[PDB]
């Protein structure tokens, strides 16, 4: 078959514009996040219980963009935020951190796969990015890895706030 590769991802930075509780649904928020493109994608977010309103508003977020997009409890999220988690007696979620000083739409890569073409749109037959999770993990230094390699930008190597050894997920 196909190479199963990360650079087969469209990752990028992304900027949390707006963050709105979910209409239909107690645990999703609605966002609008710059990804570098005309207009911000929104996004739906499973983090309500995990992660208070204000400190997503205008936050700097990683966003997995080639996703097939799908309507979560009524409304369309076009990408999903990765995260970094583990679940112990209670989920622990915590949103993936782009480098410091990094801007809407910087391609976030694995190190060695930044020149690969990422697939037009991720068939879920496929399972590409489930594959691809297999490998996925936050070292001791709590740095998001495939395969034990830094996913990173040009400013730097993508990271979470203290899920070490934790998994990469989307929720």
Partial sequence: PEEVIPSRLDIRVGKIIT?????????????????GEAEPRTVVSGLVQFVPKEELQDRLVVVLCNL?????????????????????????????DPPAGSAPGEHVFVK????????EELKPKKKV????????????????????????????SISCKSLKGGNISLE
């Fill in 19 to 35: 963050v709105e509780k979910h209409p239909d649904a107690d645990s999703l928020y609605v966002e609008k996040i710059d990804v």
């Fill in 68 to 96: 097939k997009p799908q309507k979560m409890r009524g409304v369309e999220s076009q990408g999903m935020l990765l995260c970094a988690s583990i679940e112990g007696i209670n989920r622990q979620v915590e949103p993936l």
């Fill in 112 to 119: 060695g796969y930044e020149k690969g073409q990422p697939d």
């Fill in 129 to 156: 990015f489930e594959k691809l999770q297999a490998d996925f993990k936050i070292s001791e230094e709590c740095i998001a890895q495939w395969k034990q390699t830094n996913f990173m930008t040009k400013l730097g």
